[PDB]
Amino acid sequence: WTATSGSCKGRCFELQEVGPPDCRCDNLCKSYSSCCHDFDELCLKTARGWECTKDRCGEVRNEENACHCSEDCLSRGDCCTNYQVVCKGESHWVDDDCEEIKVPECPAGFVRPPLIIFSVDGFRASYMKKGSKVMPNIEKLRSCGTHAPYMRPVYPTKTFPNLYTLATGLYPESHGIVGNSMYDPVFDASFHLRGREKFNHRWWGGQPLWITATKQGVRAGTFFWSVSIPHERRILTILQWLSLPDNERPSVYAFYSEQPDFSGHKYGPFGPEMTNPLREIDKTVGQLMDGLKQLRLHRCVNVIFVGDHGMEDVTCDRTEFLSNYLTNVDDITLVPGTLGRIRAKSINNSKYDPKTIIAALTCKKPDQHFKPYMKQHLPKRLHYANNRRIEDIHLLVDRRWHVARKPLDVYKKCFFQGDHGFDNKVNSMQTVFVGYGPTFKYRTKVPPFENIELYNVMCDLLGLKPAPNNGTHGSLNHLLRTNTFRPTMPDEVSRPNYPGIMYLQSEFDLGCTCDDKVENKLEELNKRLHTKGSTKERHLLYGRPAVLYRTSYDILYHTDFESGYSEIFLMPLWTSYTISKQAEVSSIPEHLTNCVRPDVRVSPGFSQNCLAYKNDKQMSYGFLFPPYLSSSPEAKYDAFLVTNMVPMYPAFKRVWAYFQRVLVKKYASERNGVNVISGPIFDYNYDGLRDTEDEIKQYVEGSSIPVPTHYYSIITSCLDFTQPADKCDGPLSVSSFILPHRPDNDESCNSSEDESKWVEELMKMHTARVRDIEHLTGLDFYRKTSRSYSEILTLKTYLHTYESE
Ligand SMILES: *[C@@H]1O[C@H](CO)[C@@H](O[C@@H]2O[C@H](CO)[C@@H](O[C@@H]3O[C@H](CO[C@H]4O[C@H](CO)[C@@H](O)[C@H](O[C@H]5O[C@H](CO)[C@@H](O)[C@H](O)[C@@H]5O[C@H]5O[C@H](CO)[C@@H](O)[C@H](O)[C@@H]5O)[C@@H]4O)[C@@H](O)[C@H](O[C@H]4O[C@H](CO)[C@@H](O)[C@H](O)[C@@H]4O[C@H]4O[C@H](CO)[C@@H](O)[C@H](O)[C@@H]4O)[C@@H]3O)[C@H](O)[C@H]2NC(C)=O)[C@H](O)[C@H]1NC(C)=O
Ligand SMILES: O=C1NCCc2c1n(CCO[C@@H]1CCCCO1)c1ccc(Cl)cc21
Ligand SMILES: [Ca+2]
Ligand SMILES: [Ca+2]
Ligand code: NA
Ligand code: NA
Numbered sequence: 075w076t077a078t079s080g081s082c083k084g085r086c087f088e089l090q091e092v093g094p095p096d097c098r099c100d101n102l103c104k105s106y107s108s109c110c111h112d113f114d115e116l117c118l119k120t121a122r123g124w125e126c127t128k129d130r131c132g133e134v135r136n137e138e139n140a141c142h143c144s145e146d147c148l149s150r151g152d153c154c155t156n157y158q159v160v161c162k163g164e165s166h167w168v169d170d171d172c173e174e175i176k177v178p179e180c181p182a183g184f185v186r187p188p189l190i191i192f193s194v195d196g197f198r199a200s201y202m203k204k205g206s207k208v209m210p211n212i213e214k215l216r217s218c219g220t221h222a223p224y225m226r227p228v229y230p231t232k233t234f235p236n237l238y239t240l241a242t243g244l245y246p247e248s249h250g251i252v253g254n255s256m257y258d259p260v261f262d263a264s265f266h267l268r269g270r271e272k273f274n275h276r277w278w279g280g281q282p283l284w285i286t287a288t289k290q291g292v293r294a295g296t297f298f299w300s301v302s303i304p305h306e307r308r309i310l311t312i313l314q315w316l317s318l319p320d321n322e323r324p325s326v327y328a329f330y331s332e333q334p335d336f337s338g339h340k341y342g343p344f345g346p347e348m349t350n351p352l353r354e355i356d357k358t359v360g361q362l363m364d365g366l367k368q369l370r371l372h373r374c375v376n377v378i379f380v381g382d383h384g385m386e387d388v389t390c391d392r393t394e395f396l397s398n399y400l401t402n403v404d405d406i407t408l409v410p411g412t413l414g415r416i417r418a419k420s421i422n423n424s425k426y427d428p429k430t431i432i433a434a435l436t437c438k439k440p441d442q443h444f445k446p447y448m449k450q451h452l453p454k455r456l457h458y459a460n461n462r463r464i465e466d467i468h469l470l471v472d473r474r475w476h477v478a479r480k481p482l483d484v485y486k487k488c489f490f491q492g493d494h495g496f497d498n499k500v501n502s503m504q505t506v507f508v509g510y511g512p513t514f515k516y517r518t519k520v521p522p523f524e525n526i527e528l529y530n531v532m533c534d535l536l537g538l539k540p541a542p543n544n545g546t547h548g549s550l551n552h553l554l555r556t557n558t559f560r561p562t563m564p565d566e567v568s569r570p571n572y573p574g575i576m577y578l579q580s581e582f583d584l585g586c587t588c589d590d591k592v593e594n595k596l597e598e599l600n601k602r603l604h605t606k607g608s609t610k611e612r613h614l615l616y617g618r619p620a621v622l623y624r625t626s627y628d629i630l631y632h633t634d635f636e637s638g639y640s641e642i643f644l645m646p647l648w649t650s651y652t653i654s655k656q657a658e659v660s661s662i663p664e665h666l667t668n669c670v671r672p673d674v675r676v677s678p679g680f681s682q683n684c685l686a687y688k689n690d691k692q693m694s695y696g697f698l699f700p701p702y703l704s705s706s707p708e709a710k711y712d713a714f715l716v717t718n719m720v721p722m723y724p725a726f727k728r729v730w731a732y733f734q735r736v737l738v739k740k741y742a743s744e745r746n747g748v749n750v751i752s753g754p755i756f757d758y759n760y761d762g763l764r765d766t767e768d769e770i771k772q773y774v775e776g777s778s779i780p781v782p783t784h785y786y787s788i789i790t791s792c793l794d795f796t797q798p799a800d801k802c803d804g805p806l807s808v809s810s811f812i813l814p815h816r817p818d819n820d821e822s823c824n825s826s827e828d829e830s831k832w833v834e835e836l837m838k839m840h841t842a843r844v845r846d847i848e849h850l851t852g853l854d855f856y857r858k859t860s861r862s863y864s865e866i867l868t869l870k871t872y873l874h875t876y877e878s879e
């Protein structure tokens with residue numbers, strides 16, 4: 075109930091929300107059907123439109139008008155945005171040369187530069203270049219301020235997940251808005267874009283920027299705008315709030331535009347109808363900047379122009395139907411479209427089985443345009459599994475396609491030509507970032523970055539401490555002139571042991587054998603030096619990784635590689651080695667095929683054993699440092715140490731062996747040497763974080779050898795590829811992956827073919843940031859470089875995407 079009989083007189087776009095049944099006058103009252111009776115009349119004036127004209131200049135104030143052109147309007151803070159241009163001979167902001175804003179130039183009484191976030195729904199990154207001729211105001215913001223060529227959204231690339239990620243710094247699995255549509259089984263409630271459930275606070279986790287601000291004494295404008303409030307009125311409201319007395323005036327504001335997304339769905343991302351929506355958005359930006367210039371705020375305010383996601387060509391005819399695959403399609407519920415989420419239609423149906431649904435959906439049609447995954451098998455870069463609102467069965471849909479349950483769903487709902495939601499690495503899903511103002515840099519291009527990083531920067535711009543989030547604070551310091559955040563590296567928690575030779579061969583009863591009984595003072599001292607770390611400078615190029623949790627581990631040195639060996643997990647946490655451009659690949663000699671050698675530095679009690687692998691019919695083993703890249707026949711024996719062995723399903727060994735034998739050398743050839751760090755990951759609860767030992771669900775049969783859920787590699791070289799990886803003077807270049815450790819290659823439909831036709835495609839899908847691997851391992855990399863720490867944080871957030879231009 076709303077007592078709509080109260081009044082909005084002197085309350086128009088009030089900032090404090092009043093509680094029911096008292097009527098509302100705020101920018102969301104329309105969405106709740108709760109505005110006072112006179113809200114349209116008083117607050118949504120439209121008379122005489124949005125622009126001053128020559129005859130209006132100096133007019134007598136008529137309170138009925140949408141905006142004013144009378145002499146008093148500047149002191150009232152309610153002139154039309156073009157008032158000074160039409161009536162006082164001023165220029166439009168867009169026509170002024172740009173001039174560096176070295177310091178904020180703010181009116182008296184301003185405690186800090188205000189922040190205005192101008193958000194545009196569906197604004198595809200390539201519109202910045204492709205539409206630049208029809209967007210002069212946006213082009214000026216972009217060329218004069220700080221811009222990225224694109225900004226990566228979060229998955230799914232849908233509106234509500236991305237807008238709430240922008241607001242919180244969190245992945246959707248953590249903030250809880252995991253789609254535009256959701257079912258929460260604990261609440262037994264459904265979230266939809268239409269209707270009222272979405273206003274219930276139980277959906278919304280984390281702490282959004284407007285709450286962070288308010289908690290820390292920084293006042294915020296209300297960020298949300300009811301769809302029917304015209305853009306011109308949104309801009310005029312912001313400008314009016316900026317004229318409030320110092321003690322009442324907010325420091326942070328948001329504008330939102332439903333365009334170009336709205337037209338993009340109807341016409342496709344580049345439909346000829348798209349030019350007009352782009353011109354109109356640019357005109358709104360112009361109104362804001364002219365309005366700021368009139369208030370003497372255009373060299374005081376930081377403006378962010380940012381999108382939520384892009385837009386792809388998608389039509390009804392490119393729809394896959396689950397009814398062409400499943401016999402039991404009436405027993406499932408599908409969340410459809412550019413991603414699929416499947417659960418049982420009825421919790422009383424004990425015939426429901428996810429294993430048979432996945433199998434029926436796997437590689438069934440030659441050109442199949444979606445791939446099914448249990449959510450824990452999704453690429454870890456998507457961070458899309460740790461929430462009960464995310465169904466166990468996920469369909470990753472090819473760009474340009476939809477999935478639906480039955481054909482009747484698609485024509486009892488062709489209309490549309492655009493959609494979004496796909497994998498957030500897809501080029502058409504990328505969106506925009508521009509920052510303009512005193513705190514941003516001048517005429518500066520920055521590399522693409524993820525939208526999870528922006529909350530921290532918005533907090534920096536307002537002097538706020540961010541709530542705990544998934545950004546890496548400091549990784550965007552290169553966007554900022556001042557207000558940088560200068561973090562310290564985390565402290566190492568566990569220090570390593572450096573074991574020497576402590577065990578005789580006969581103390582081991584591991585059931586392993588090796589033909590290494592073939593027998594020099596000159597060269598004996600040399601092998602001892604390698605075991606003491608004499609080659610460590612070559613193979614450990616950026617310092618040893620720091621272990622950020624409590625554990626017992628040993629550093630082990632060898633001619634060709636260094637490792638940090640965990641006595642708890644019975645295998646390395648990390649293995650580090652450098653392969654020069656000139657390195658040669660060799661085979662595993664015949665007499666060493668089944669060779670595994672006790673490591674006399676490490677107790678039998680803290681070693682793997684070969685008998686366990688013999689007995690475990692499903693499990694084999696591989697090596698972290700590859701025997702194929704040994705520097706000499708003699709050094710190759712080190713690669714067969716039991717302390718370099720890790721459990722690997724035979725199907726996974728196909729992938730790993732091809733990476734080690736073929737791809738590493740390929741990368742060294744192309745990048746002028748590479749440093750590689752490889753290791754295991756255990757994430758049995760799919761929370762993106764390192765498992766403790768009591769979370770491990772699978773062991774090699776009969777043993778305490780834990781089975782990794784994933785294997786990672788971090789591959790680093792010199793950004794200036796004219797310098798070899800091991801003699802690099804300047805910035806670094808990285809690519810990394812987190813490969814799922816699966817007992818089949820069902821994910822790769824072409825896996826019966828030679829590995830040259832499918833393995834690298836698999837690896838690209840599972841590309842990762844170093845920071846993703848840090849979370850999953852409790853390790854901290856790049857501890858000892860010559861580079862600034864913020865530069866290193868940016869490098870740790872890099873994702874190599876393998877998308878073209
Ligand atoms: C991305 O960044 C985020 C933010 O930093 C990281 O997420 C954090 O990770 C922490 C570890 O997973 C986690 O810490 C836990 O906090 C628990 C208290 O949580 C509440 O309070 C906070 C603070 O206000 C709040 O933010 C939480 O919000 C979550 O839950 C609500 C629903 O109530 C949602 O609306 C909201 O969206 C959010 O959900 C997300 O997180 C939860 C987990 O908290 C998931 O289940 C959801 O799926 C979703 O992803 C909460 O309201 C605290 O209780 C935990 O302590 C337990 O574990 C410790 C281990 O130290 C143990 O010692 C304790 O005994 C305790 O265990 C007991 O409970 C167990 C489970 O019931 C039980 O088995 C035991 O036997 C014990 O009885 C824990 O400290 C922190 O909450 C989140 N924060 C957020 C906002 O998500 C995230 O990791 C980053 N991601 C990556 C990849 O780096
Ligand atoms: O105006 C809105 N109308 C459409 C639904 C909607 C709007 N805003 C406000 C604008 O916020 C964006 C992103 C955060 C930073 C400021 O700019 C939202 C914010 C979050 C969510 Cl989840 C949905 C929103
Ligand atoms: Ca959107
Ligand atoms: Ca985990
Ligand atoms: Na075996
Ligand atoms: Na396959």
Ligand SMILES: [Zn+2]
Nearest residue numbers: 196335339494
């Ligand atoms: Zn859309």
